[PDB]
Design a binder for these strands. Sequence first.
RNA 1: AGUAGAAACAAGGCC
RNA 2: GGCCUGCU
Lengths: 94, 249, 735, 716
Amino acid sequence: QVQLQESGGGLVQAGESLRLSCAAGMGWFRQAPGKEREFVASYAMDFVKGRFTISRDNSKNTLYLQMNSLKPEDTAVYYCAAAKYWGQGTQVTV
Amino acid sequence: MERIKELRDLMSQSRTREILTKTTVDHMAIIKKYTSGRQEKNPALRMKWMMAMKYPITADKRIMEMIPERNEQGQTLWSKTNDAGSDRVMVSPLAVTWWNRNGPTTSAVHYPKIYKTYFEKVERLKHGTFGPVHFRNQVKIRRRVDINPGHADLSAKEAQDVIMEVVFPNEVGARILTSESQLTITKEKKEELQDCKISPLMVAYMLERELVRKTRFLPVAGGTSSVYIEVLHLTQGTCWEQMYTPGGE
Amino acid sequence: MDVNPTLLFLKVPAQNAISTTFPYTGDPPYSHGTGTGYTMDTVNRTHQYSEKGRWTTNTETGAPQLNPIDGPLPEDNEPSGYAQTDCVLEAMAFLEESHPGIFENSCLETMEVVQQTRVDKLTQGRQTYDWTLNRNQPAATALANTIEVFRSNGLTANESGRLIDFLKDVMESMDKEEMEITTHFKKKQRLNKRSYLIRALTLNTMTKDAERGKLKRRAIATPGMQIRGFVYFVETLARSICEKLEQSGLPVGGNEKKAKLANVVRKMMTNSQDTELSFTITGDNTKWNENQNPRMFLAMITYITRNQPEWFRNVLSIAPIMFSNKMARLGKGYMFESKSMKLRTQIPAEMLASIDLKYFNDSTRKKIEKIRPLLIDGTASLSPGMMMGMFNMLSTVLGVSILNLGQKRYTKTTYWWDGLQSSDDFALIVNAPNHEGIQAGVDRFYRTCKLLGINMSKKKSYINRTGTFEFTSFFYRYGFVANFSMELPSFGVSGINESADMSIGVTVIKNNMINNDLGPATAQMALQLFIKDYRYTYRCHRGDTQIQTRRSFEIKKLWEQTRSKAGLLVSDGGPNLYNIRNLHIPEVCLKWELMDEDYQGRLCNPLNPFVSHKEIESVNNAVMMPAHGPAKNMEYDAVATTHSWIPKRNRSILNTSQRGILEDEQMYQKCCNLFEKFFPSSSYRRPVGISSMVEAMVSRARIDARIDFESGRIKKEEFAEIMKICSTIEELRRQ
Amino acid sequence: MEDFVRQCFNPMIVELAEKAMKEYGEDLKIETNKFAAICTHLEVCFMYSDFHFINERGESIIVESGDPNALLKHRFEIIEGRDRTMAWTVVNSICNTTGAEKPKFLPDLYDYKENRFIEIGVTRREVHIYYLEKANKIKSEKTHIHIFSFTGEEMATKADYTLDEESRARIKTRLFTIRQEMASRGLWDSFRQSERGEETIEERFEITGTMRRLADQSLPPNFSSLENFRAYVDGFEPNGYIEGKLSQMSKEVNARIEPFLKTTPRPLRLPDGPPCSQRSKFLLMDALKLSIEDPSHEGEGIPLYDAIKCMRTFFGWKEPNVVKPHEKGINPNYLLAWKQVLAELQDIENEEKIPKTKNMKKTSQLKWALGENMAPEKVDFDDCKDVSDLKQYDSDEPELRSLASWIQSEFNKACELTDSSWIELDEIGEDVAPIEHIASMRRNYFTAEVSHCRATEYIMKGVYINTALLNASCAAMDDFQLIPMISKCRTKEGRRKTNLYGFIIKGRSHLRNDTDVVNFVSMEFSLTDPRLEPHKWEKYCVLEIGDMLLRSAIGQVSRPMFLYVRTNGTSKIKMKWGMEMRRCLLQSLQQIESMIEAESSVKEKDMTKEFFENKSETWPIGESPKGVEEGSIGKVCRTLLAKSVFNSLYASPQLEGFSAESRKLLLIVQALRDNLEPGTFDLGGLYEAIEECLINDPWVLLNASWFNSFLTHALR
RNA sequence: AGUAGAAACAAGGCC
RNA sequence: GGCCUGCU
């Protein structure tokens, strides 16, 4: 019943910014190439706190993840999730 | 006889009849407190302002038939103009002093028996023995202490039934007091005040004050006894201690 | 040489002579005219501290309301009412965790009280805004008028005699199409749904007088009678909660406040080792009431009442629901003067919505322009925040939650803090290993306060090392120091009556000797001055003097008539036997053994026409509004003498269209006196039941005539006369 | 089943049973058999009680209809049919009058012959079980019990049946009528067993209708219904949400502590403008006294005669003339008022007995001086809207005025000793305890120190003037009244003396509100020439009225003697507070006694005598150009008394605001001097709060100057 | 005029 | 001119 599509990923410079959006409680999760899933935001993880901000428009049915001051260690597929329902993910490469 | 007669007279007039009919017993209190008189915000200012008027106090209508309208020189003692929202008439303060020099006299022998607390205080102080004043810093520490020295180990509600059965034996209702201490208190205060005619309400109030235990938080240094706390102002100070032993001990 | 008292502080520490800095010997400031300007200013200020919220229009009242909750976080140190729901819920959760079982217990006792409370408890209150007449009236009068209107409209559940049933009727009135009210000028007027909603949700605004300690005047509010029961229940719950919190100081007295302050300072400093530094902040909160949103109180209570019967939750939630939609009456109005034509005019505040702005100055013009959008039917919507400390206890609960949120278990850092909160005032003791730690702790405390809609007044606050601080005019310097300047205004004649004034004065001297460290010689001087003022006020001079007054003749003849003149009361022109040892004895009992039996009997005569006693509550209780504090009641020891008269009433009702209230007063008092003569316990214990007056009175007449014959004065002739007179009044009540 | 009670029973019983139904709060539609059963119980109660009368004998007289007579006594008097409160009222009354025992449950009837209760109950079941059932329900009962049952049988203990048997035949005929009438109805499928003692109820407080919608509009911004918000709250648990917002919140939201050092505090700025004027209601430093040396006490005497006698003691009167005009009024009116006062004083002197209180004529002079008929007439807005001049009352910050040096000298000479005792204290109970003796000795020392002080004279002047003014306003509301300023002192030689400073004319004083103003005109003699400090007398009109000769070694001075005349006003609150000026004595001497006690707590001994006699210890109580000057404890007493007196005289909102906002800074400075590392969050805000209270009041400006001097001397 | 200070008093209303 | 009220 809940389909999800992520937008707003891509190639960015280190120290740059990026606004992920997921069209549909909700979470943003990430997967680096050599690992399983990592919690980003729902609350934010230690590795992304202060840099990254999660915000939703319930009238647009969209969840946003505003990433700033990006590091090479953010480089992952960023997946959106609804709580059981998972997006396909958007590639972010820093 | 009389009581039902003014009852019938009240029911004669339509408005009072309606008030008596539609008003239920529970609303008794409400309508009794129903008044247009606001509670004064600055009592001192108006007491100093009203006493400069003629006829500043109020008294029952009966005053018009016990005290003459004027004294020897013609200073008026009472007026026939009633108060705002009562049948009482406004009268001059002289009508008080007049009542204390030529008014009716009675036998006040039973007031000491009624106002037990105050007379016990007086008796305790009259036989007290003072001692030397010692000047040294007093470490006043704040503690919860009982101020009433005659409390019979009863709470407010606990002694309220006792008070009713002592004064209003018929309105007690379901309650029949179980504790035997209450039994003896009822017996004593019943046989003692059997014909006292001060007022049921004041008798009940003073019995409540005497029997009910009351407690307050105060800065004390030493003492801590009920008899030693009523004179806490006289025995303990900022830098002086006055040894005292009430007459009871 | 020029004299300068302030230089005295160069040798005597400031707190040891702080009494000199309290000019409480002169007339306190008073307001003279309308309080409409202050009301409008307060409304605008409350609405602009939450400007960044979101606007809506209520579908029932049609008024614009501003919701700032969960709004943007503040980016400046200015006052802000943008409280965050999640943060406050978390604070309450931590409060519960640190004090398990607090909410459940408090809710249990509150449920007991609510389901056993009676309607008459609402009469025990000061002025309340009666909507039947759109004016402030005594609580009992407003309650009676509202009950009469409800019964006339068909809402008679309050006849059950239960406050919960009265509130049920109040809520049911909200869903009525058309109510009816009475007005005298009697005319029956019809109020539609919206008009009655606004009349039940509105507040009456006045100006606070006798307020010492500030140059500018403020405005205060009084709610109606429909919302006071819910407020009573909510405050009962909040009091039961705070009584379980040692960090709160609102539900206690002054001495308890001092004891708790001493305990907390000793706990904080003593536990601190040599390495930890300690600092005390003497904080005041700016715009405390204007920044507390009722929706947040709703959230706090619904979190408190979790896992409780739904009816309890609903009845406790009704109050903040009405405060969130509360309206405020602008006030008396505005008075204009024309010097060219030499006249004056008084326009009511309700015209501010439509009246042109040519008559108003720039400041008032702008205030009206800003407040007009919120004007609905002559009253302004005040949703964003509380007006004047109606929820004192819930605000104290929130402050105590903030204080407890730094117990070093939630700080997660070396620094920590504690202290005491009493609404609008607090003392905060913060300990940390270094000045940087103290700075971080205070910064985080301030930030957390700003997340709950609470602001700290930086201008009226300062931080020093622990050992010296202030709290509600109590100056602590290694131990609390007496002031005695706060109680100075209470050293005169109270203004109740002669005996009451004497007893109250001596008792006040005694108490201030016990608590405020009043000196012996100072107490004797106070006694002398009080006696002088008492004699000069009541025209009762020593009697042996030649001071001619309106009462000096009767007093002098009483003096010359009496043999043992030492027993005469000061009220009757006798000598004063009071002293430091006799301050706890009533005057009558101190002079009892010296009075002549004739004068003693004349004085304490039950048949005197002056003494009047109404209820057990008003026997020896005097309401003295203390300086720099809320109205308080005192028990004063006094003997019922001929001097216990009650003074004259206002008597100005005779010139007003509300003149019939006096006739109703007289008739109600006549009926009440008759009932009391029929039911002697009417005063001491308020009667209960569901029957009507005449039934009880006639039936008790039956029985008492019977039994008083079975032994007493009655006779068969009289008993039968009473029986058939009872039948006569029965058939009269039939028709 | 209710149709039966519709049909058979009379109204009286059915509404009695309906009110008994309402009594315990259960509804009649759910279970009605109880209604029928208890109404039949009530019916048997009536039918058993009525038709049964007694006369002075026992042996009840039974009449089918009560004949007109006094002989209508009822044999059995009913208990039930009444509310619980009244049922217990009758129970208690019977017990207290009959001397019988009080039952714990409700009886049904009382009887005289046997002087006891009857508890009638007719149950469906047979008697011989229900009887002992209710008997074991009732503990140790002497009330006789009697029950019937439908089969027709009767029983009772003692084999006692208390009245006629034809009545009981009546009862059982009624009983079987009931029975074989239900026979036509058919109710015994439940009649025998229909009540089992159910007592339960659930309290229901439901939010619905409009009040529910209001609940839906009192939630956080992103909630739609109270149901959803309560569900969210119940499901809410702490998951570190305060930390997230604290991290996200801007760092500019801080409470940084600014260190408070010696160089931090700056002197308070005083307002600049025209010099400050005099506001007192009477002359303080420039007063003059005409005396008689009479033996009367303060209140003893008659005012007008004393004033006239004092004024006749002075010779050298001259025709009055203007010296310094009011600069805003009509000085000739003041001149004419003075001459009118003199003329009417003579008029009183001529007649038989000096009146206790005199009323003056309402001439145009005092009509203007007292501001009569100047209040604008009150009208309605609908009649005055086109008037361009119509606007609000002038509401702006008061005029700014700079401090002058006269208030400093006035306070200086308000703390100086005098050649008289201005306090005659009342009596107290003879001291019995040693502590009372110590208190009395201390009090005597302070009275000796402060009685000879200008502050006490000002206290007495203000108290007397305000008392007289208030009493005259309350008594003579309409008509202008003359009141001579009188104060009685005692000389060093011990001779009592009276002093007449001048006169006060009170005007119309119809004071309703505590803020309503009563206007009067005050005239006071003096010798101080007003040509040296004119700015201090902006609102006064000063005439030349005579010459005075006081004995001096320089021949004899023959100084001029002027009259300060002005229009002033007060209010009920101001009069009341000025008539309680004696508490300044309290304030001051409480402070001094606190000092003495604090010092004596160090040395275990009372330290009053050496403080007042040796005068070794001194406190900083003023600054001279040489430096800070210290004085003995008595001078501190007088200084504090003068400070309190001036607080009571120049009271104003400015004083309160400045006092509070300067006590804050004083506490901060004290913390600094105590080495307690004081800190502030916004000191500029506190300074601005203090500086906004200083506008035009001489007293508050002098206090601010004193505070600046204290800061300058402190912080070292 | 005067009192006082963010608005008022310097009598009100009723005939 | 006559009368009413002084916290309504």
